[PDB]
Write a protein that binds this DNA or RNA. Sequence first.
DNA 1: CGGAAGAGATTCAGAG
RNA 2: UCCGCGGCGCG
DNA 3: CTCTGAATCTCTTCCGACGCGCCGCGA
Lengths: 49, 455, 50, 1341, 51
Amino acid sequence: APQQDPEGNKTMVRFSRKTKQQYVSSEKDGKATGWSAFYVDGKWVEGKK
Amino acid sequence: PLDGGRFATSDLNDLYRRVINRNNRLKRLLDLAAPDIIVRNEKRMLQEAVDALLDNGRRGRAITGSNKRPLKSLADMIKGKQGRFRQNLLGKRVDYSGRSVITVGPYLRLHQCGLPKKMALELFKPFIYGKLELRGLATTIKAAKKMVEREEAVVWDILDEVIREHPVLLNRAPTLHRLGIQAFEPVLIEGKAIQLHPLVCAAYNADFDGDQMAVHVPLTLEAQLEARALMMSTNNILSPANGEPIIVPSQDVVLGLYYMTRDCVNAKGEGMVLTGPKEAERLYRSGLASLHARVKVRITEYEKDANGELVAKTSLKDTTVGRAILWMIVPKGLPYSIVNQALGKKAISKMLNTCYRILGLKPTVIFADQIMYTGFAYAARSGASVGIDDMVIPEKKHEIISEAEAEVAEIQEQFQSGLVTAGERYNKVIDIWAAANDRVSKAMMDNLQTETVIN
Amino acid sequence: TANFREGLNVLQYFISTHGARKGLADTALKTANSGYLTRRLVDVAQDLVV
Amino acid sequence: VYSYTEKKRIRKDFGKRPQVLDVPYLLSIQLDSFQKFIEQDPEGQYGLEAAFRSVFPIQSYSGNSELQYVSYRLGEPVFDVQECQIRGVTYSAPLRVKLRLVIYEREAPEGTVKDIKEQEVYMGEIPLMTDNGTFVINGTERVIVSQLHRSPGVFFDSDKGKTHSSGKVLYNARIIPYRGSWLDFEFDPKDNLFVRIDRRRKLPATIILRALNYTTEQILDLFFEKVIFEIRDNKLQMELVPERLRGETASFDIEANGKVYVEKGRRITARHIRQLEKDDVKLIEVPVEYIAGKVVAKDYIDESTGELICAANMELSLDLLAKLSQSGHKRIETLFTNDLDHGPYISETLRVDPTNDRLSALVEIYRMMRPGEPPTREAAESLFENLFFSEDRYDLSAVGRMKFNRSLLREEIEGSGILSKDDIIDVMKKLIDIRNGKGEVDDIDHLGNRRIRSVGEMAENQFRVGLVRVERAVKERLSLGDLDTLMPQDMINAKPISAAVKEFFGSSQLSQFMDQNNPLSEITHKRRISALGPGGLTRERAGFEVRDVHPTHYGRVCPIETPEGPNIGLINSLSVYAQTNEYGFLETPYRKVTDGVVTDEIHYLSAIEEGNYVIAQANSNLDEEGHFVEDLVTCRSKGESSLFSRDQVDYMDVSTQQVVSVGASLIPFLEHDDANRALMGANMQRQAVPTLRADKPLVGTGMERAVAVDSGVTAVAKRGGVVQYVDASRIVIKVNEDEMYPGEAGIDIYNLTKYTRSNQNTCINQMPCVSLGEPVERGDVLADGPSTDLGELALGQNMRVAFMPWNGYNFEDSILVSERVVQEDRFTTIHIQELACVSRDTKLGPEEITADIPNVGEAALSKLDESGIVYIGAEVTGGDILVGKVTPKGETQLTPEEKLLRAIFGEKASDVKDSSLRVPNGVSGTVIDVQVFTRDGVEKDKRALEIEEMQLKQAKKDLSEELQILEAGLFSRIRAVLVAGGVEAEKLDKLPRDRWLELGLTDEEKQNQLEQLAEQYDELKHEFEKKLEAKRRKITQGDDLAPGVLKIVKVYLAVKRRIQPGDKMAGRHGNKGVISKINPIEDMPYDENGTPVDIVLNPLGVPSRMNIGQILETHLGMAAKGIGDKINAMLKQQQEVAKLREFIQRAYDLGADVRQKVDLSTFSDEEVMRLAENLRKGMPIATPVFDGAKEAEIKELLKLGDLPTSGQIRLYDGRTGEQFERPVTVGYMYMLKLNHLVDDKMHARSTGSYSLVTQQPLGGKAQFGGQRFGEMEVWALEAYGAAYTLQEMLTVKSDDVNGRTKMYKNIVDGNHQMEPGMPESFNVLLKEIRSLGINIELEDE
Amino acid sequence: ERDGLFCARIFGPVKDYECLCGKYKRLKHRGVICEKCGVEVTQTKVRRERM
DNA sequence: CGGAAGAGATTCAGAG
RNA sequence: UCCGCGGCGCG
DNA sequence: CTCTGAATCTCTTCCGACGCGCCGCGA
Ligand SMILES: [Mg+2]
Ligand SMILES: [Zn+2]
């Protein structure tokens, strides 16, 4: 998974209960940056939350 | 699914999701003993969500998505011109259909339309598979498919065999009245334009400036029997709106007949006597007499007697060479007097109507086709054309306009002396201009319409 | 005053354009009303059969 | 005199009227407005600076810190325009803003700064308009249509009683801001006055009047006029203006000067008014009934008790009158109600109001605006105040202020964008005056009232939206945390700005996709004006009155060019001379009249001023002194034409053609034909397709030069000089010595767009039209573009046309064409299609591009390389593979019995399947270019590496050739400077060029020039190497592509398309026609010399369509080629050039009083020979629109051509060899191909795919779907008795998921059975109705 | 997802005679339920029907 | 937008 | 193999 | 002087062809 977001913030791993899958998200000052990346069929895709 | 692995969710799914979410929230707030106002707010939101699900936009502000558009609820799937009722239950899209730009074909008989070969192959591909296996040229559907996609000329022979009696339907959007859909027996032409017979094209309200047309093929044999017996253009001669025929010529056909029947005071070979219309045709084609020349000719006609027999009569009559030529195609039973005048559009209309009443359907159809052929041919030989010298301007016009403007100046100065109200001044000016315009129109018609020539 | 064979001046042409655009808008609007009216009449009379 | 270039093919003008003003640069509005948007501005009037200042600075109070704006600058666009178009990235430049952050101390004064920090923020990216006036968005050309909308201001309007239908008239006045809430004021059938806000509700006006800080008595005193009465015992006095008497009936005797005189029961007239005025009466004595029925104007007080007995707007109760008179308040004030002049409307509103006080009205307004919440004084006050008077929530722009004042007749022109109390009361007074009838309502359709909003205003509006969003974010960051330990770079988020601007350019309704059929189409689409869009109008709500022509359209908006169909009227085109006033009102040029002599000075007018003055008609004849010949010159003024004397005229039209746009202006003989057909022809002319070889039009309009040069397609000579070198693709021109700047190389180069996909799949090609050593002049055209020849518009082709009915093949507008036309490729056209292949990381391994395709013949693969890409230049046909791509199919597990069944079957049931791109059905052509784009970190295959190698080689050779040419120019300048004196030409000649540049011939300024150019050479080699390094990294670098795609491949397919029956062709006068027959050349009619006709048209259309002008065109054609033929023969006999020279001089002199007056005596004989060479194919004739050739001149030209004077000739029918008895009109005509080729429309579907939900067949050609048996057709079938075919149409052919399978089976078997099941859409409807909660079910199963 | 808007256990299998768990794959078990899940071995047409 | 139709609410006239 | 929304375009 | 019915006024809802063709975009 992408280790850093487009702003260069750092990323954490979260569970999307609505779709039963892991995703990655970034935080700044401990608040969510509103960015997320998901795994969909052998690839990592990223965008606004 | 969408490109990039995304998915378009139907709005109904989102409305369902929202209602599910609100229901779950209300149940959780209930089962954990929430305070009163909170559960009241949640249930009011749930009621609003159900309202959105069923009939979003029916009350207050409509729900909307990210696109800032209102989501289509269930009710919107049945209401409106996009609704399920109008879009799909009526007005289905259909298989075995094609569309193409139309084109004049004058060499067609009345009941046959010119259909491009490629469209015929595509439409009748199932029938071709069938007959090709039936005649043993192909064993399996894969063999038939690969053979037809290679266009092995035997497929073209089979294709010519299949359609020989297979009517097809032609439709022009909008189908204003039932004539808008008609049945034809196809004929195969290279190219890509559907060719119509001009006479029925007049009924289609169609033109040839780029109008498209759609073709459907009936499948079952009861269906094609229906198409032949009911819909074939040879049956729809009479409009439903009134008893008068709908198959009526216009444009070049009428121009040609009018030229063919018009006589002049002096022409090549005037006054000679012809023993029969065939000799009239000979003398015209050999160039020793012009169509317009007046002549005496021996002609036979017939009448439906009291019993129903076509009793003959023969006599000398005064006529024109062109009129005899036209008479030669007229079927037995109509009186010669029908032809012996300058034939306009209305005259041809009443001629077709009287043919249809006096005789059966098929003589009228044959008469129509012969009329179309002869009219086109003689119009072409005529060489009628429009030139700048033709639009003669009556030289009286300058004088009349000067008179009118003099009167305008007179009434205007009369108002300048305060002798009349402005409204009546306006009325007087309008009246005098209208009078002058009518006078100019009469002068123009008088100068154009008649001319002097030596006898 | 000028006919079509002689040239129309710019004023005559301009005032004439009024009728042209009036007619084009007229037919553009009329088509919809005619279609709607036909749909209605069909709906009312569609049951009747000899 | 003519430039040397223009000496080629001097077109013969016929215009008699002189031209005093050249046509302006046609695109000026787009370019100038965008420049105004982006360019720097110190005053901050418009664009970026204005937008920033309208929001900045930003201040935080608790933070005690400020954000403020220094300046903005625009960065360099990293990619060139063609690179953007190739790679699909929007042509944009970085927005850089200089920002400062301020923190003050925590002690008074707050202005005491303590720290300042400054830095430059990359706050967004912004599109740049290309030089041609079009933007580049993603990979597409897009041009923003300038909108036309209702101006801000105040308007006054009336309906002719349509709403209430009793016959009265109702009035309303409306105020429209640039942004913010609307207000409108309205009367009533009961004559009450109502106010509404954003059309929410309907309320009495006094609500606002007391909401404004005014009390009731102030309201009456302001709106109405007051009369005073006195009571003494029981004798009654009133104080009077004698004019106030006018209108009433003197039912009672009236006294003046101590004498009483009235004819009772009679209305007071002017003699009475004059009698009283000469009497100078002041106070009179009146009966009780006269003061009875009068309104109480104000509160009245009784001091004997401290009590009030009089209220506001109350009638006169005699009891109250007695009480107040005995109390001592013997004076009474009342209003006046003239039944016409002084309607009591405000008083009735004051009666019907529910509110009683300012705060009551405020809370009522608040609950109206904000339903469902408890009112509060602060909430209502804040809502009202911020709504109308917060200059950020509401703003009449300066144009709003100007219109507002000028409609209110106030002297001022400028003012604050917010309303005020006086503004509201003034507009209400004006509405009252209108209701009285001393005025007139406003006409909104009038063109002095609507305003053109260009791209700059929309761009700055979207950018302002971005700015306000960013401002909210910034104030939030300021509130949330500290101020010292951060930089504003992080505070500003570029996300909202880029989102807003990209959303505007991509999504917005006015950002419509560009069309590129031909240069004229691009011009007219750039210039087009739309009434739709944001804040505009909707096609459903557009009534006739907005569509109809308004008399001030003259000279501003072309009435002709409007599109047909439902969009008519709502879309227009700028007239040729119209330009935008700074306020956005349209503006037209005019020539000053000065005492009967036209000054030829030029003044620009708007519809208001034009209506005010008197302007003379263009075609008015003049002397050389400027005096009109006629005294009663026809003119127009105040929207009406009439006659006027020589002295009354104020202005004169500039040129005849100023009423029409370019699109109409191209049509010759426009003055001779109807408006409907002219409109259709003007619109159709846009659709013309560029031919394989361009041709001039014989009967042009002179406009072709301006349009062809002004469009972007042609390469124009930006710097004069001599053409040094030319090939198929490059032009190198030596700039002359004087024109070149000091330090420049003196050489300019141009590169032509050789072949590319146009925006409508047509070709775009540039062909040079000069030869080595020919001089070229500033503004010359060096290279033709599509449909351009020698710099003249070349849409169509020249055809020889006879007007004659021919065997019905030209029945009903049909066109019959001679095979000779096909054989010469006269109308052959070149088309380009672009196909894309996308490789993705599919389940069970990626889907890869490869030449390893299962279940396919090897011969097809041989067309591809081993990588799986077709070689360029290969011919390909429908159904063939262009690029091989393959998808894995997953596990596809087989049971061992199925495994052995597969094994005995063969290699089938593979887990890997073909997915390769295939030629579209019916298409065939040649493969011209192949492109790959691939993600970083993936290997470049053989095709990818080979194309990258060839592209880098191309870049290297291009840069090196540029180096060689420019260094040759530099060393030529070395030669030019060194020969000037102190020469060592041979001593240098032995030395190599490096010695030349190094060595010093002298010690003077020449050596300074040599050193300057040597430093230039060093700088240019260094910039060349830097450019090539950047180019190589830019080529080698990967691409972002899209999510999930490994690599995309695009292949370019080009096809040559040919005229074919069913194709549509049309002539400029608007006579469309479908080609219905090709004819063996022998069969076509032929004239006496044996040359056949090419196209046969039906004449019957002409009188009924009234396209008389086209016939005249035909005649001119026969004349034009006539001269050509003669001159051709005169050339072919190779006689003395002097004879043809005098003949050509005669041909030019042939016109009568024509402005042309060209003479050959100044031409040298080789120039004459070149002229003859171009004139051999006919002499082009120029005919202006409304001053065109006359019939006498046409006849004279024909007579000089030795053709029949009538223009008709005898003709022989080829098919029989006989002679037509009638003469026929044969001539030359200009014809176009209309981009509706038959092979793009013919379509047929036996069976195919089916939709998911409805199970009905798909729609449209692309999906290979079937036609739609619409409900009208169903009614048609119902009209017949044809039940069975209807049932078959609905059930089996369309929707039965099993019945159609059975039908297919039986048809294949040769049995035409049928079995109707149930339409699945019916089950869908049932399920939806049940899901709705309504139970519905079938019965009697 | 089970119990979701497209839960195969309710509406039936996404594919003809294919259990979500992959327990059964062909018509030999046509018209039986899986034990690991409540999906039924039937045709996809049932997806159109069941509410 | 405009026009037309239906339903609900408010006002005026007639009768008590 | 696909629900559209917006836009022009021809009937 | 008051009450009821009828009439009028206000507010809300429904409707203003059929058919094909391309382009863009799409939480
Ligand atoms: Mg048509
Ligand atoms: Zn299971």
